[PDB]
């Protein structure tokens, strides 16, 4: 609950 | 402002290299594709006038008038820029000095004038990184560190931010960006 | 004139939701540096390593202040104005202020950054929540009627009245990720973090202070007693 | 120690590329000659077990025994490094970096270690500079800025120094290092 | 260890100058002078600020800066395995005859870290550095001949400069010291004698 | 006098 509200901005697509 | 219906027909000539969309293939041509009108524009300005210098571009944009490139940049900032991916081996590090900069080297981080998401400021101007070419982002970090480009006005933002930045803290930093979204 | 908004310092929810926004839409340019993350964790209830995987960017430790890699001199060069210290705007400007302010940013070309503010005009700051609010602009839109305080709303269907002025902040649709709404409670969860960044007391000292004032109450009694007597 | 006298004569295949009496003509190949002995017998050593990578070296030590590279050292140190001369338009910013180091950014200044005259400290190993031709300082600086050259030891000596040196910076020291004397 | 004597004259400002130029030039590679400041070693040692600037400020500071260096402690430490204590009270937590005979007594030590050994400082963390001055000395020390510029006695200067410049930079105020105490010391003499007399004079 | 005292060590040699 507190990690999904804490959950950062920025999503990176990483190879793999 | 400008026309993004006729900056499609009027940006015909640059998706050779930025692609139809702006969503260039090839890694060394930027993405136009979702950048900020105003960032578009400043760049083919200083790219017209030698402020910004495109050897690719030479003579490219000197018969096209306000207008057209006011067009042709709310074309291309009407489109959406196609996120790549970050190399796994770098994206910790490349993460790391966009989200949080360098407290001790006193680099600020990447976020606040670009957004978290890298969508960049289009009002103020600050370029979408976000899914932009590592290629390109590289090449302009280290553009910005060496001085060969200074078309980021006085105040010197990027070059001052770029000069805190090492090759490995580039390549981290163009290879997360390359994935950011 | 600002916009009230009533916040809720025991909202934990909230109080996460706006560290969260904090850390990531406004640690770029703004430090708390006078807040430690570990303090911030323990007061919002978030585990220590979950703050450290999700709020801490900067690579500082769990006990280490929030502080950024943007330089006050270099930040002032850039935007025209320094970006003050935020662990005590919410003291300095009111939480009233702070939710008027970062609701009231509108494109204006004429400015450095292509954006002004109603409540702090011609401020150096540049709109970072666009991408959420999406663009806002000083147009026309529907603003419920109001004669000499007469506020008009709907006997039926309980909304408002409106009638259109022309001179309002209206946000461009389609334009933002949130809607007014959503926009709204992202800012008053970002405003109620900053209140308790100001004042991280606050909850421990009304508590405190409601034992004090028992405490002295009975203490009243008693001198009053001894004093009212032996007077006799 | 090695013996000069006998190491001229095991010297003589080293002076195809660095000179017969160690001062190399080529910018790229480094001068021996007046070089620190426990210097150059470290970069033998380290060039032999692969802890420095000379690929123009590939093969040229494996053969000499440790008597031989010491009486190799030995006669190189003998000599005396000549001098070339500084860029005019690079001499200040080099000289101010070799002097001074760079106080805000933690940078040393050369002249610690180095002499300040740039003799290096032969029995602490520190290697001689002053003379030495700037296209070589300028690439062993980058080695060291980039993590490619690490036999400076555990403690990462130099490859600290030269992560706060720009190439700006590595050119303008290294033409004063080559002018230093 | 036994030390020797230096006779160290503050009042000597060309002594104090070479000395100055010998630690901006050898010593402030490694270690800060950082208490004290370029503008006031220029004004005691009677060296014009221009002049100041342009031959002993090597840092890019201002006249007024302290004499701060680039090597940060941390580093110095980590490289060295000792860091390069700031120099500007060394004089008065050594003494000058340590100085003198510390810097002096550098011989060659293939054993240690940097191939040197101390005899005033055994095992010391130094480089030694003015090995280009002194030349190569080896252990009883004794400079190998044609090895170093300077002889024994040209070498005894240059430390010996060296070390006044050191022993007025731990203390500035001496000769401001000597001279205000004379005052003052006078004016007790002449209050003493006033004192005495009134007290001689009530306790009749 | 005081010039020549403080002569920095390090000597640079430069183009014409
Ligand atoms: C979360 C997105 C943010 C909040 C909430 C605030 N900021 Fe900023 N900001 C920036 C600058 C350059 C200034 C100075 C402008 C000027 O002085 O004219 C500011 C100012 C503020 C203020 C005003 C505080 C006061 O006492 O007047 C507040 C309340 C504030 N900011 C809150 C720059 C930036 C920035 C760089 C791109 C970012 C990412 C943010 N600000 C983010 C937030
Ligand atoms: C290949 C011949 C090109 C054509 C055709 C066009 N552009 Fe391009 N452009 C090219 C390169 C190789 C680069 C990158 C330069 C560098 O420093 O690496 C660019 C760059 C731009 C930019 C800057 C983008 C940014 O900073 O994010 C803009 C705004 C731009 N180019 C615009 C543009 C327009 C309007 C064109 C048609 C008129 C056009 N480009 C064609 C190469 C080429
Ligand atoms: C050309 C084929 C070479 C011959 C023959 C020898 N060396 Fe060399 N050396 C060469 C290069 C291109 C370099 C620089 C490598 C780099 O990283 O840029 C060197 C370097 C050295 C060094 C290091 C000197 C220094 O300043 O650190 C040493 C000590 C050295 N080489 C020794 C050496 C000896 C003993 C040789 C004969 C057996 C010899 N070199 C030959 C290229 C060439
Ligand atoms: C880096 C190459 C150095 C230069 C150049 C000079 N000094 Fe040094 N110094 C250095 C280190 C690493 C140390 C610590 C050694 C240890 O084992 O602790 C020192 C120490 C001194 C001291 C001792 C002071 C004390 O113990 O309280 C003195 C007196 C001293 N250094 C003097 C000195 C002088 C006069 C120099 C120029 C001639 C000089 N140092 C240069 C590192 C370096
Ligand atoms: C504050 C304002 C910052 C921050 C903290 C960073 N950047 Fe960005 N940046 C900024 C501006 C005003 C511009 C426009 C420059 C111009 O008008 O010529 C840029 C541009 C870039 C670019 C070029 C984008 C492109 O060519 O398409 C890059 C690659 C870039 N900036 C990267 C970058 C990184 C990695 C940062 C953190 C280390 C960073 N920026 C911070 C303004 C600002
Ligand atoms: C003290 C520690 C210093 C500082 C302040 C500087 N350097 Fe130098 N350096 C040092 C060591 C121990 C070594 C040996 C590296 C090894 O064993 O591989 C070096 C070496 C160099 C070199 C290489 C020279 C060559 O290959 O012949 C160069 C070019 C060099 N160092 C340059 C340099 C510069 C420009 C400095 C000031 C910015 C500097 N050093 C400081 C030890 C130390």
Redesign the interface.
């Known amino acids: ?3 999904k ?12 | 402002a400008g026309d993004a219906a006729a900056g499609q027909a009027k940006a015909a000539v640059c998706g050779a290299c930025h692609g139809a969309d702006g969503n260039s293939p090839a890694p060394n041509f930027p993405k136009l594709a979702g950048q900020g009108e105003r960032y578009l524009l400043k760049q083919m300005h200083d790219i017209k006038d030698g402020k910004r210098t495109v050897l690719e571009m030479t003579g490219l944009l000197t018969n096209l008038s306000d207008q057209d490139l006011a067009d042709i940049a709310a074309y291309f900032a009407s489109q959406k820029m196609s996120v790549g991916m970050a190399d796994p081996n770098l994206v910790a590090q490349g993460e790391a000095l966009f989200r949080g900069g360098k407290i001790a080297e006193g680099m600020p981080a990447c976020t606040g004038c670009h957004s978290p998401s890298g969508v960049g400021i289009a009002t103020a101007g600050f370029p979408h990184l976000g899914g932009q070419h590592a290629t390109y982002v590289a090449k302009q970090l280290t553009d910005f560190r060496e001085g060969t480009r200074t078309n980021d006005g006085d105040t010197k933002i990027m070059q001052s931010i770029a000069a805190k930045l090492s090759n490995k803290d580039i390549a981290a930093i163009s290879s997360y960006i390359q994935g950011l979204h | 004139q600002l916009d009230h908004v009533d916040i809720d310092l025991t909202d934990k929810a909230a109080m996460q939701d706006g560290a969260r926004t904090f850390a990531n839409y406004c640690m770029g340019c703004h430090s708390a540096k006078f807040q430690r993350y570990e303090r911030v964790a323990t007061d919002l209830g978030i585990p220590a390593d979950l703050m450290m995987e999700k709020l801490v960017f900067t690579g500082a430790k769990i006990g280490d202040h929030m502080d950024i890699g943007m330089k006050p001199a270099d930040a002032k060069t850039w935007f025209g104005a320094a970006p003050p210290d935020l662990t005590l705007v919410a003291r300095v400007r009111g939480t009233d202020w702070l939710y008027s302010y970062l609701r009231s940013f509108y494109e204006d070309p004429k400015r450095p950054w292509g954006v002004n503010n109603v409540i702090f005009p011609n401020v150096g700051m540049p709109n970072v929540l666009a991408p959420l609010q999406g663009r806002q602009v000083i147009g026309c839109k529907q603003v419920q009627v109001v004669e000499d305080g007469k506020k008009q709303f709907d006997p039926l269907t309980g909304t408002p009245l409106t009638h259109e002025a022309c001179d309002q902040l209206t946000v461009v649709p389609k334009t933002g990720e949130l809607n007014e709404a959503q926009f709204d409670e992202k800012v008053k969860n970002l405003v109620t973090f900053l209140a308790y960044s100001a004042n991280p007391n606050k909850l421990a000292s009304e508590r405190i202070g409601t034992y004090v004032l028992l405490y002295l109450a009975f203490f009243f009694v008693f001198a009053y007693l001894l004093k009212r007597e032996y007077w006799k």
Request: aromatic letters at 0%; hydrophobic letters at 45%.
């Open positions: 609950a507190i990690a509200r804490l959950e950062p901005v920025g999503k990176v697509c990483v190879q793999g």
